[PDB]
Amino acid sequence: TDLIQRPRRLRKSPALRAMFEETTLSLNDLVLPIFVEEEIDDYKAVEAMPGVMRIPEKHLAREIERIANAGIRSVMTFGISHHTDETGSDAWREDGLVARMSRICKQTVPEMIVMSDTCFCEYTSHGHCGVLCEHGVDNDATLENLGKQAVVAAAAGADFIAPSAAMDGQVQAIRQALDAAGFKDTAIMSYSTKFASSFYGPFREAAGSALKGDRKSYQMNPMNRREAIRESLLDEAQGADCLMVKPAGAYLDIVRELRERTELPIGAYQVSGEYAMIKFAALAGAIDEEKVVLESLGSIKRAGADLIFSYFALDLAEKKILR
Amino acid sequence: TDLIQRPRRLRKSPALRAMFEETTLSLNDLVLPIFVEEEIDDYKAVEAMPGVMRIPEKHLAREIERIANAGIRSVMTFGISHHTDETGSDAWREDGLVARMSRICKQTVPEMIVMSDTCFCEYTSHGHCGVLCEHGVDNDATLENLGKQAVVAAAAGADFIAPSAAMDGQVQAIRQALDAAGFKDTAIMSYSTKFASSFYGPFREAAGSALKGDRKSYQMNPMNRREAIRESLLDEAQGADCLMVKPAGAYLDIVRELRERTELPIGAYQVSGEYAMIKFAALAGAIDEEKVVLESLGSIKRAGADLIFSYFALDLAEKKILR
Amino acid sequence: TDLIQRPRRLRKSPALRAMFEETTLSLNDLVLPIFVEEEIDDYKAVEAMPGVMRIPEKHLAREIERIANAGIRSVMTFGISHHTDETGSDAWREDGLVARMSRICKQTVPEMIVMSDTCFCEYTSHGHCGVLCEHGVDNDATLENLGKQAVVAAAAGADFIAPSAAMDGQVQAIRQALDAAGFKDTAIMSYSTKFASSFYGPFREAAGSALKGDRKSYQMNPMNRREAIRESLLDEAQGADCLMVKPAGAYLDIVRELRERTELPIGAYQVSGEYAMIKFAALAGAIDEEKVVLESLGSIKRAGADLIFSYFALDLAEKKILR
Amino acid sequence: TDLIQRPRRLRKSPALRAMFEETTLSLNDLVLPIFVEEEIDDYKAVEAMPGVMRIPEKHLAREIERIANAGIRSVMTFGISHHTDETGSDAWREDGLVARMSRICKQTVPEMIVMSDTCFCEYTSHGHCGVLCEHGVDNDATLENLGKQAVVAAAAGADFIAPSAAMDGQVQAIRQALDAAGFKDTAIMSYSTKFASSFYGPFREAAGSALKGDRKSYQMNPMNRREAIRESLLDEAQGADCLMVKPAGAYLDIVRELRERTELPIGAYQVSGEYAMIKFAALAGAIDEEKVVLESLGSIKRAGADLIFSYFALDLAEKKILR
Amino acid sequence: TDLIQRPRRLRKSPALRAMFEETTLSLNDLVLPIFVEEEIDDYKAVEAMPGVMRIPEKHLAREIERIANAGIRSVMTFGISHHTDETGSDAWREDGLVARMSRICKQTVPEMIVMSDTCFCEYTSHGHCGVLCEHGVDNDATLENLGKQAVVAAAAGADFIAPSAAMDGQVQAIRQALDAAGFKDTAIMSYSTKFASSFYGPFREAAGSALKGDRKSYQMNPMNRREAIRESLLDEAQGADCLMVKPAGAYLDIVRELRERTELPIGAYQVSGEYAMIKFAALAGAIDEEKVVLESLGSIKRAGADLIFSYFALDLAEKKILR
Amino acid sequence: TDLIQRPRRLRKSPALRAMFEETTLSLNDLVLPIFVEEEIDDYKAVEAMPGVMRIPEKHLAREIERIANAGIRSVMTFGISHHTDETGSDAWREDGLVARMSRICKQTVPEMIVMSDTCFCEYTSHGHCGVLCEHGVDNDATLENLGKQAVVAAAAGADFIAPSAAMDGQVQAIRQALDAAGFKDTAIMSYSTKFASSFYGPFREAAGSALKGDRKSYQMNPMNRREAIRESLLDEAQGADCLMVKPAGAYLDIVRELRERTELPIGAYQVSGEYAMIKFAALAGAIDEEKVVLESLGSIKRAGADLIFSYFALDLAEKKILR
Ligand SMILES: *[C@H](CCC(=O)O)CC[C@@H](*)CCC(=O)O
Ligand SMILES: *[C@H](CCC(=O)O)CC[C@@H](*)CCC(=O)O
Ligand SMILES: *[C@H](CCC(=O)O)CC[C@@H](*)CCC(=O)O
Ligand SMILES: *[C@H](CCC(=O)O)CC[C@H](*)CCC(=O)O
Ligand SMILES: *[C@H](CCC(=O)O)CC[C@H](*)CCC(=O)O
Ligand SMILES: *[C@H](CCC(=O)O)CC[C@H](*)CCC(=O)O
Ligand SMILES: [Mg+2]
Ligand SMILES: [Mg+2]
Ligand SMILES: [Mg+2]
Ligand SMILES: [Mg+2]
Ligand SMILES: [Mg+2]
Ligand SMILES: [Mg+2]
Ligand SMILES: [Zn+2]
Ligand SMILES: [Zn+2]
Ligand SMILES: [Zn+2]
Ligand SMILES: [Zn+2]
Ligand SMILES: [Zn+2]
Ligand SMILES: [Zn+2]
């Protein structure tokens, strides 16, 4: 036939394909979510998340050295609480689990980039991301508490305060609180566009989130692309240093759209449900885990993500699959 | 706190959330892929795709009636061949499996829109998508055969000829071929952006594709977003009635970029691999299948797809989960 | 002939057309304007609006249950006043018609989305949308009163306070008033771009608006597309949760232009004159009412409207034409 | 209140509003559709279109003179045939009704710009816009006939050949045809975006279109905005001198999107249905006809139309409402 | 001070800076230019390009093995001719220097991607890029010869034919030529935007280009940014597989503008002059060579280049500075 | 061959090329960086910068007259300090070197445009661009001092205060300080996008900057194009009269991108390392200095720069190469 344009020409050998590959993925693009449980002794496997385990607080100094030695540059701290209550106040206790997780990480590996998850769903008896009032989760009462938690996490050494409470004005609240306390240099990794997804089941199992209803009244609608952009642009306006799309996997259209609407760095969270789905199809022998993980993380980068929160990070690190 | 902008205002209730939902998913958005195996008697279960079975040719009249009864408006045919050879010539035999799958569907259900997968990987002894040469899969030898297959399938009643060979100029070749033989009205549903993905394992099992190596010399690189758009715009230029992104789940950024680059309809294939990861994670009790399937399909719609190829379409239709 | 591109290919059967339909319309997209008259006993037909009737206040609890049972998710309340005066002060009487209409609706169907029309043209002896002063309608005196009305409507349970007075700064005024009174969660459905149209005659008949001149000094010029966009973008800037184009029917260019200029939800009002025109041509046997209604509402959605205010809503609901 | 931006500032008076009016409507924006019935003696009233009458061929010289005297710069001819058949061949008879309507207009008023409707629904026994086949309306059989009709109408003096058959490739066919016969200077006014609307009932009555079914296999879907633009850009590509959206009243979003996609002139047809809804609502005394006609026509201008096809053009011209 | 936005927040440490680095440079981004001199025995040092030497043809098998061992994925061949003449015919001799440089590279290292410089300035007695006429370099006489050279080099194994003659229509000429001779799969790497720069002195020394005058009648003006884009888009239109900007260092604005105007791969040539200025400044001890080379190459990547032609590639590869 | 488009047509003679040259460079586009050393007697050559010399303060009145007489319209003052200390306080001494350099220039040539470099790296014992604190360079303590320096430089007659400290909020700080002191007319030439480049070695030698580490914690990452734009747009937002990209040479993609994102004038700094690289390759006889300088400065203008800071300026001036 007569065809002048032939895409296949640059696909002929592995060398040609390597030369013309548009997107690349490094170990640097990954942030490792870590689960830390206070007052316990043995690491606990998370069933819903094949390979993940809660790290006993007594072993955190050891795991963070392990992670750092594998080449992971950053972690996101999630605690499993034994001092839950109606407001999740242990989260702003200058010495509670949240402060302690940071303290230990920064003390152990000074150069480790410590992002402290900032919410209450893991510290409240009801499992909601804030103060429950007659109304539902109280936005402004929760903003107050998110700010106090911010200051003690910054106090403990957290490099980024990451609000995941899906509260309006949360970035502004945390920025003023940090500044007022002399933490004007502490960064905010906002979970800016965070969907009321059905892919967090494994995570809730892993983190001990005691919730029976849903978070549909704060986390946003999965179907709303316009609203998703506006959620992130409001956070940019309130001073976030980095934005984020959560989940990442089934939202790369949102990542790409946001990429074109801001100059800010954009993070993407490869959530627990996405991890479970790769892990369980691999164990059923349906897919090649490694090929599927690399393709998935590669797609997230291709969509425009600057950083990817991924539970596969340390394995990828240690098995020298990514450098 | 001071906030005039409060996104949560429209999230207060189920009624408010429904009123402001930006994207909708319905049954007419779905196209159901079916596997038909010739010269066989019982339905065969696909191991890697729980719930999916090869339909015996003898029972296709029965199944396409069932499918149609469920509300499914369309199907994509894939045959499992017992007449494979060097060039996959059974596919262009006037009464080969390709032509008969269409014939039995259109004759049983005249209203059923039948899209006929158009390739050779299911009919070649080597498992590759075309004619082999010392070269690798020979582009132009394959184009002639795609043309021949197009006319017999068109003659057999197929409403869409869907070339999935990833051959340069395939749409033009098939357009020229159908036109000359008097099928100027038969449409082309081009797998215009078809990535050399690792998510097709389950499908190859289901369709009996005898491939030992890879398809990287013709299916495109997963990392190449600019190339992906160019791939589809070259097919729009060639006359394609509908364009397509495959896989869809991890390529929503592609679907969205493409939506902004053409006025043509865009299909998105929720591949066997995606189906597999959802089913095994649900079997493992880690996620809720239905909520995860609906979220997954809704995101593909959200990203810009007009039609979605889903192996979940029949259950969603019969269980009246989508109307 | 030789034509590669053939649009007609996807128009061959009802099935194909259904698969390729770009826009859809659900019962969810509709908001039902309701006319409630205090101190009366029998429902009154509105002559200019064939099929519409004023609901006696004593029957409102009954009609709102009827509407809600038909599946309508939201209503817009308009009262016919028997206590008109120079400033329309019954509108901010904590117990006047406006408060009462809301009170009754929310008390009867707690989940009903109650949008309270916010103006004075129905409560003033002169029929103008505010305070008449030497000058004409006094913008700032009217802003004051619009805020007080907002608080009592929010107090009564209105979900959205909908200013239709076409007063500059009305959204800002209503937002500060609501916030100050502890109604920071009450939404604003601004009639942001509201034209000085000649299509409201039937509505004025239906609502008892006692006006002899025009509203050309506040409602904007029908011919000004640039000004129309700016009117809506100013409201976005002042905190509106939802914007609106009124009328909708002969302004879909304005709807589409606004759609591309904001991420906010956009409402469109299918006004009384548009309803009368469909109703009277149908009664003269000139057109098919149902086909024309569905095509018109479908066009409004196609233009970019997220919600449509429509008097045909309950019929469409009950006759199961829309679900 | 504090507001530096007050849109009402330029709305204070009639002089200020006129000075800032963005869009203008004049008589030269209007094209007058006329119905001419052959072999008949008295004017026939169109029931569904009050004020509209079939003009007897014998009286056309008289009427086109009247029209021209009124200031009308152009007309679109529609003939009511007494010579219908299977293929609508009277339309391409050198002296058939199509050719004579043009001839009598150009010869009576040499300056009159005559646009000749170019189709077969008014000349076929079955009422469809072309040649029927087992298929439905045969596209390419019809294109040949459109070509033949184009040359006789061109030869008869028509200034524009306006194909309203909704056939793929109609503009190219008619361009090729006129060119070969030496009418390289005759223009094409393409009904480029012609929707399968329900607003044409009154017109079919007025023009005697013997159709029992629908035109959905060729006129396009009302819901398809992206397809609508593609429809017109394919005609610009084919050489069309002017493009068009029909209907116009409920498709102003289309007109505006198209205005932004081409530098070509764009016509908009205010259809019989729109005319009917305005007239019957005015008869019912529900709206003011003149104010509603002027607003309706002004919105079509506002949306981007260069020319408007209106059945109100003559009254507006004679009553000196437009100059 | 009051500042919510503090860019320095993500600059606090080496880890934070790496995590937020937007652009990456790797070894696969580099293509290594090599100078091969025929009929000679020892390596010759290039004075003006410290570190660069003419490789004796006899030692090419050895060197391409060394290059390939280092990790270099590709080279661009430039031969120093001992058979120059009026038309540069040695270049299209089936076994001329051009064909043999390719042959020895592909045969020694089958995986090596060989791009063959395609011109006549190194083979013509007058030193100009083609056939001379009273005119100056004759465009179309040269195109024929570029075509002839393309096929022998293609036949010899070259993976890319890279026309650097700056002839109008060179890509089409070479595409037509390779196609006819059965090299439809051989690619074209067009020096699409090739400026008449003053930075090529060192290269001419290294490649033995016998030119006394200038190339301004064919290489384009350095000041013309709009012309530069037009130059490359005409080559994309002609079928070029990859486009290119030369020089690259002082034309990063061009590279970036071009990146936004095409989806095609874009190469950028870090010319001999740039290489020379870096080396001599480093020799003079004024700058750090490595830091300056890495910054220079990283900026070309940053600006949008997919591939970079660099004379520093081998040292960077062997010293393991890039992987 | 057949080619309609022939770029070469406008390249045939020097006259044609001159007519079609898109970009031009005048002496007006250049700003001359001057090095002034207090308490010394003989001009000192800067080894790293062939041709540049520190001007003894006692000779400044003489050199500025020389510069002005050559036609240079503006200079950028850099001092070599003999009164360095921990905070660089001599920089805000109403009579220190910074004040004095300006004083002398404006006193000598009243019409000379005096841009005073505003930092501390030349006045601090540690060589950092501000106040060193436990943390690193203290952003806010440095902002304080940058403001005081601004007022005394404005006091001395500087026309532009040019902050090069890469401190967040520096433009805002300097603007408030200037305004408060009655210097609301003094302009700010912000070094808005200033990279942590490896091309400043020669400058540091020339300016006596006593730094042993790097400026990576304030000057921005060379690889971050998105951040580069945001750095400049923040300065526009804080009131800068002119923006700047530094370095210029290997950042013309950044210059072009910024050009398209602001209406503000954009300056570009052809840094010392770029000067050294041209000078040393010219001395090694590798390139033609003049041709390379003119091409480089011409590229900077082509990329979008309105003013270029260049050390070659006075030579270009005196040798009448630029007027
Ligand atoms: C937000 C969502 C948590 C929840 O709603 O339970 C913060 C945690 C994100 C990670 C969830 C996951 O990895 O599934
Ligand atoms: C604004 C216009 C009312 C008026 O000017 O009388 C608020 C009511 C909109 C609906 C009017 C209608 O449906 O005609
Ligand atoms: C900023 C950079 C100076 C440094 O970091 O030493 C202000 C001076 C710019 C000119 C530097 C040069 O010309 O190299
Ligand atoms: C594409 C090629 C599939 C393959 O096996 O390479 C055409 C069929 C797409 C379906 C694949 C799937 O569902 O996994
Ligand atoms: C389009 C087809 C009309 C039809 O009856 O299908 C060409 C004529 C447009 C005028 C229709 C009207 O005015 O209603
Ligand atoms: C372009 C022409 C070079 C010339 O000498 O005119 C093709 C080769 C580019 C390399 C030039 C260099 O590296 O300086
Ligand atoms: Mg938010
Ligand atoms: Mg293709
Ligand atoms: Mg307003
Ligand atoms: Mg058409
Ligand atoms: Mg060229
Ligand atoms: Mg800055
Ligand atoms: Zn939470
Ligand atoms: Zn295949
Ligand atoms: Zn009102
Ligand atoms: Zn017709
Ligand atoms: Zn050359
Ligand atoms: Zn400094």
UniProtKB/Swiss-Prot annotation, chains A, B, C, D, E, F:
<keyword id="KW-0456">Lyase</keyword>
<keyword id="KW-0021">Allosteric enzyme</keyword>
<protein>
    <recommendedName>
        <fullName>Delta-aminolevulinic acid dehydratase</fullName>
        <ecNumber>4.2.1.24</ecNumber>
    </recommendedName>
</protein>
<dbReference type="GO" id="GO:0005829">
    <property type="term" value="C:cytosol"/>
</dbReference>
<dbReference type="InterPro" id="IPR001731">
    <property type="entry name" value="ALAD"/>
</dbReference>
<comment type="function">
    <text>Catalyzes an early step in the biosynthesis of tetrapyrroles. Binds two molecules of 5-aminolevulinate per subunit, each at a distinct site, and catalyzes their condensation to form porphobilinogen.</text>
</comment>
<dbReference type="GO" id="GO:0004655">
    <property type="term" value="F:porphobilinogen synthase activity"/>
</dbReference>
<dbReference type="InterPro" id="IPR030656">
    <property type="entry name" value="ALAD_AS"/>
</dbReference>
<keyword id="KW-0862">Zinc</keyword>
<feature type="binding site">
    <location>
        <position position="204"/>
    </location>
    <ligand>
        <name>5-aminolevulinate 1</name>
    </ligand>
</feature>
<feature type="active site" description="Schiff-base intermediate with substrate">
    <location>
        <position position="194"/>
    </location>
</feature>
<feature type="binding site">
    <location>
        <position position="121"/>
    </location>
    <ligand>
        <name>Zn(2+)</name>
    </ligand>
</feature>
<comment type="pathway">
    <text>Porphyrin-containing compound metabolism; protoporphyrin-IX biosynthesis; coproporphyrinogen-III from 5-aminolevulinate: step 1/4.</text>
</comment>
<keyword id="KW-0479">Metal-binding</keyword>
<keyword id="KW-0627">Porphyrin biosynthesis</keyword>
<comment type="similarity">
    <text>Belongs to the ALAD family.</text>
</comment>
<feature type="binding site">
    <location>
        <position position="119"/>
    </location>
    <ligand>
        <name>Zn(2+)</name>
    </ligand>
</feature>
<feature type="binding site">
    <location>
        <position position="215"/>
    </location>
    <ligand>
        <name>5-aminolevulinate 1</name>
    </ligand>
</feature>
<keyword id="KW-0350">Heme biosynthesis</keyword>
<feature type="binding site">
    <location>
        <position position="231"/>
    </location>
    <ligand>
        <name>Mg(2+)</name>
    </ligand>
</feature>
<dbReference type="GO" id="GO:0008270">
    <property type="term" value="F:zinc ion binding"/>
</dbReference>
<feature type="active site" description="Schiff-base intermediate with substrate">
    <location>
        <position position="246"/>
    </location>
</feature>
<dbReference type="GO" id="GO:0006782">
    <property type="term" value="P:protoporphyrinogen IX biosynthetic process"/>
</dbReference>
<feature type="binding site">
    <location>
        <position position="311"/>
    </location>
    <ligand>
        <name>5-aminolevulinate 2</name>
    </ligand>
</feature>
<dbReference type="GO" id="GO:0006783">
    <property type="term" value="P:heme biosynthetic process"/>
</dbReference>
<keyword id="KW-0460">Magnesium</keyword>
<feature type="binding site">
    <location>
        <position position="129"/>
    </location>
    <ligand>
        <name>Zn(2+)</name>
    </ligand>
</feature>
<dbReference type="Pfam" id="PF00490">
    <property type="entry name" value="ALAD"/>
</dbReference>
<comment type="subunit">
    <text>Homooctamer.</text>
</comment>
<dbReference type="GO" id="GO:0000287">
    <property type="term" value="F:magnesium ion binding"/>
</dbReference>
<feature type="binding site">
    <location>
        <position position="272"/>
    </location>
    <ligand>
        <name>5-aminolevulinate 2</name>
    </ligand>
</feature>
<dbReference type="InterPro" id="IPR013785">
    <property type="entry name" value="Aldolase_TIM"/>
</dbReference>
